[PDB]
Structure formats: C-alpha cells, structure tokens
From a paper:
miniSOG (for mini Singlet Oxygen Generator)1 is a 106 amino acid flavin-binding protein that generates 1O2 under exposure to blue light. It was originally developed by Shu and coworkers for correlative light and electron microscopy (CLEM) as it both fluoresces and catalyzes the photo-oxidation of diaminobenzidine (DAB), providing high-resolution images. Novel applications are being actively developed since. miniSOG was engineered from the LOV2 (Light, Oxygen and Voltage) domain of Arabidopsis thaliana phototropin 21. The absence of a structure of miniSOG so far had prevented to rationalize these observations, which we have attempted here using a combined structural and photophysical approach.
We have solved the structure of miniSOG at 1.17 Å resolution, which shows an increase in rigidity of the environment of the chromophore compared to that in the LOV2 domain, the location of potential quenchers of the excited states of FMN, and the phosphoribityl tail of FMN lying in a tunnel bridging the bulk solvent and the chromophore encased in the core of the protein. The latter hinders oxygen access to the isoalloxazine ring. 1 ΦΔ=ΦT×kO2kp+kPhot+kO2≈ΦT×kO2kp+kO2 Our structural results above suggest that the low value of kO2 is due to the steric hindrance of the ribityl tail within the tunnel which provides oxygen access to the FMN. Regarding kP, the miniSOG structure shows that six electron-rich residues are positioned within 8.2 to 10.2 Å from the isoalloxazine ring, namely Tyr30, Tyr73, Trp81, His85, Met89 and Tyr98, and are thus close enough to the chromophore to act as electron-transfer quenchers of 3miniSOG*20. In addition, four hydrophilic residues, Glu44, Asp72, Asp82 and Glu103, form hydrogen bonds with FMN, and may thus enhance protein quenching and O2•− formation. Oxygen only quenches 7% of the triplets, which limits Φ∆ to 0.6 × 0.07 = 0.042 (Eq. 1), in excellent agreement with the experimental value. It can therefore be concluded that the modest Φ∆ of miniSOG is due to an unfavorable combination of low kO2 and high kP values, as proposed previously.
Residue numbers in the entry: 1 to 115
Write the structure that this text describes.
C-alpha cells in the first residue's frame, strides 16, 4: 500500500489530524471525511495496551520522537498491529508546527517480547 501517515496540528485543540494519506485510508478503511479533525486515538480499542498509550502521551508532551507497537482497529473492527513512528516537526523558528505519525501494519516484534 502507499505509505500510511497522518499529520496533526498541535496548535489546535487536542492535536487534530489535518492530513491523512491515501495509504492511511486504505489501511484503516476510513474515508478522509471520517478522519479530518479528529485525534489519532480513534484507532485504539479494547485490546490496546494503556501502558503504550501512556508512552505516546509523554512523548507528545515532551515533543520527542517515539516508536511503539500497539493494537489498532479498522473501521470494520479488524485488529491490526501498528508500528507507529511519531515525530515532532519544527519550523526554522524552532517552534513546533506538526506531528507526523507513520503507521506500518504488522506484528514486527512478537507480542511475548513487547510485554
Ligand atoms: C501525528 C499523530 C499520529 C497518531 N497516530 C496514531 C495511530 O496511528 N494509532 C494510535 O493508536 N494512536 C495514534 N496517535 C496517538 C494518539 O493521537 C494519542 O496521542 C495517544 O493515544 C496518547 O494520548 P491520549 O492518552 O490522550 O489518547 C497519533 C498521534 C499523533 C500526534
Ligand atoms: Cl495527541
Ligand atoms: Co505498501
Ligand atoms: Mg484513551
């Protein structure tokens, strides 16, 4: 599939998605109109590890890059493992401008060696 990514605007409330790639639409099964303006946490669900969610929270707060692997769900409820790479993007004035999150679908590291 084409690269799956979203870009969020941390200068707006709760870091909404302002761009979703065609690959993200394909991976998640959502349409662009179901995505724009919401927070990326919508892909989470019952099996998502909250310890991993906390790590993401801290990285966003600290404006630090992180990679985690966590369970996400398609629109039709199919579970997938998401190796999510989150990167802050700063402008030439040194100011945070965006986050980008790139999703790779797969259980890259076996679950027994995550937990
Ligand atoms: C650019 C960007 C992309 C994100 N992509 C995803 C994603 O693909 N899947 C996911 O579960 N969370 C994703 N998140 C994480 C959630 O948006 C959120 O930051 C996380 O769940 C921690 O915050 P919370 O505890 O308030 O939900 C993304 C965050 C950002 C900033
Ligand atoms: Cl966020
Ligand atoms: Co591909
Ligand atoms: Mg939550």
């Amino acid at each position: 599939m084409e690269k799956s990514f979203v870009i969020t605007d941390p200068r707006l409330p709760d870091n909404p998605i302002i761009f979703a790639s065609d690959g993200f639409l394909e991976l998640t099964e959502y349409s662009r109109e179901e995505i724009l303006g919401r927070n990326g946490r919508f892909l989470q669900g019952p099996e998502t590890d909250q310890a991993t969610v906390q790590k993401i929270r801290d990285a966003i707060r600290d404006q630090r890059e992180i990679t985690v692997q966590l369970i996400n769900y398609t629109k039709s409820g199919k579970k997938f493992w998401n190796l999510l790479h989150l990167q802050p993007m700063r402008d030439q004035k040194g100011e945070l401008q965006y986050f980008i999150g790139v999703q790779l679908d797969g259980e890259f590291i076996p679950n027994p060696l995550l937990g």
